[PDB]
């Protein structure tokens, strides 16, 4: 029923990775990173959130993603992202930290 | 150097700067946090702890002990087990105005099983 | 003690991780824990029932009791560190200035 609650929950990743939580270490690093201290960072976050809003309204494909890559760049990117998520899952299985369940 | 024992009860609502002798029985001088701030909102604040620590250190240097052993606590039964801003600010102001600090210990009441 | 002071001794003892081992958990079995606790209470009774209070404090200061528990429990399961974490004097039935000034 509520709209702006649903918008705050989904866009929380993008806001908290942009600048909005100065006690979180990743957000306190991304508040001085440079791609958020530039001139129009708030507008670029607005474009990302508007793309996610139209995706929630029913768009199947995105505007911000790049569609053509030379197959070695995309394999390296996808393999590095999967290895990063797997290493975070293992270093959270040890230390007993519970994480968000997703396949 | 006469060591007096300073109990700093740092909660989230008010901070208690309290100075006793080595026994624990005879209170030398205490200044609560809310008696230095007009606002019950800002009763638990670093400014309140700074004013309380300055008044307590002034009284205890008029009595001439000039050395404290500091025991910091908080609401520990079903509470938070962490001191509020009063602890850090009161210890900072207390040693910034004289008062060679001795032994620091955080004696919070930790229940073995409460509820 | 022999001066009829009743007191409680609370001892704590953490399990020794053996060097040149690979397994992460150094768990003693429950029956082994019960044997360790039995040897602990036997040692503290046999080495605190014979002396007076002043000799008991003189043995508590360099921690002779925890050292002897560490030495005698290592045939059951080796213990990383044995301390006596609390001493509580419950009742002192005598006020004698003779021994109380023989202290000072």
């Amino acid at each position: 029923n509520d709209l702006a609650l649903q918008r705050l929950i989904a866009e929380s990743h993008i806001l908290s990775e942009a600048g909005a939580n100065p006690s979180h270490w990743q957000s306190s690093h991304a508040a001085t990173t440079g791609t958020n201290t530039r001139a129009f960072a708030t507008g670029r976050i607005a474009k990302k959130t508007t793309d996610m809003r139209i995706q929630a309204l029913g768009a199947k494909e995105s505007i911000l993603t790049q569609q053509k890559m030379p197959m070695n760049m995309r394999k390296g990117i996808v393999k590095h992202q999967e290895e990063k998520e797997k290493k975070r899952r293992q270093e959270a299985r040890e230390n007993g930290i519970v994480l968000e369940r997703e396949v | 150097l006469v060591f007096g024992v300073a109990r700093i009860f740092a909660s989230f609502n008010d901070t208690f700067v309290h100075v006793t002798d080595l026994s624990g029985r005879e209170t030398i001088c205490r200044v609560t946090g809310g008696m230095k701030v007009k606002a019950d909102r800002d009763e638990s604040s670093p400014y309140a702890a700074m004013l309380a620590a300055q008044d307590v250190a002034a009284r205890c240097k008029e009595l001439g002990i000039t050395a404290l052993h500091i025991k910091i606590r908080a609401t520990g039964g079903n509470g938070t087990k962490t001191p509020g801003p009063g602890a850090q600010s009161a210890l900072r102001a207390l040693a910034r105005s004289g008062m060679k600090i001795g032994r620091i210990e955080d004696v919070t009441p930790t229940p073995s099983d409460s509820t | 003690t022999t001066d009829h002071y009743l007191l409680r001794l609370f001892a704590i003892a953490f399990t020794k991780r053996r060097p040149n081992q690979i397994k992460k958990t150094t768990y003693a079995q429950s029956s082994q824990i019960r044997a360790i606790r039995r040897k602990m209470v036997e040692i503290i009774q046999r080495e605190a029932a014979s002396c007076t209070l002043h000799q008991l404090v003189s043995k508590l200061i360099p921690e002779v009791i925890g050292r002897e528990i560490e030495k005698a429990t290592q045939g059951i399961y080796p213990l990383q560190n044995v301390h006596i974490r609390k001493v509580k004097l419950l009742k002192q039935p005598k006020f004698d200035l003779g021994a109380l000034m023989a202290l000072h």
């Binding site: 609650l5 929380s12 908290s16 939580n21 690093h29 007993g96 | 050395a67 962490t82 850090q88 | -």
Partner: protein
């Protein structure tokens, strides 16, 4: 009335020292994240050693330490580093306005499967409710096994305390996030600065 000034300038007679004990899987990460820790603690004036043989972090106040709350900052820092908070966040406790808290939540649910469900309900779908709570409360929340370790300002510590207890007591965190969003919207305008806000939640 609330801002806190950095310490400008021997305040210690007895050379204070604290210790905490960590296991091996933390010994690896601490061994290769330690120079950041001892660099910032040398900037604060406190010597910090690590012992991979016994598995112990020690802090101790040196001759030239001047801030007396620095030893409490360092004790909390090595507590969080033992309790596996990541290293820049554990070093972020060394600022003036931060504080940590550990919330024991295993005592709140008698059942086990109900406890697992309510803990994962606190963590949310893809972590979105957790980072929404971190945004709305300006805190860092780490759902750590049977405990929950939070950091931040003292106001945010109190709000995440309330939200974690109410999440364990079967009130939904989406309901609590809606409550916090309403409170933020009401505290934005000071025309409604002192009323009883229970007519809105």
């Amino acid at each position: 009335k609330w801002k806190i000034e950095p310490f400008l300038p021997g305040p210690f007679l007895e050379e204070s020292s604290f210790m905490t004990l960590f296991p091996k899987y933390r010994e690896r990460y601490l061994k290769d994240c330690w120079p950041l820790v001892t660099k910032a603690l040398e900037k604060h004036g406190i010597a910090a050693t690590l012992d991979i043989v016994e598995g112990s972090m020690t802090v101790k106040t040196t001759r030239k330490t001047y801030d007396p709350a620095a030893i409490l900052k360092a004790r909390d820092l090595i507590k969080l580093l033992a309790r596996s908070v990541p290293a820049p966040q554990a070093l972020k406790i060394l600022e003036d306005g931060m504080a940590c808290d550990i919330i024991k939540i295993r005592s709140m649910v008698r059942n086990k499967e109900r406890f697992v469900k309510r803990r994962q309900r606190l963590l949310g779908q893809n972590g979105t409710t957790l980072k929404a709570l971190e945004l709305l409360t300006q805190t860092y929340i780490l759902v750590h096994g049977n405990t929950v370790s939070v950091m931040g300002g003292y106001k945010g510590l109190k709000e995440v305390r309330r939200v974690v207890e109410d999440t364990m007591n079967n009130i939904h965190p989406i309901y609590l996030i809606k409550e916090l969003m309403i409170k933020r919207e009401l505290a934005k305008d000071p025309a409604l600065a002192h009323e009883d806000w229970s007519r809105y939640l």
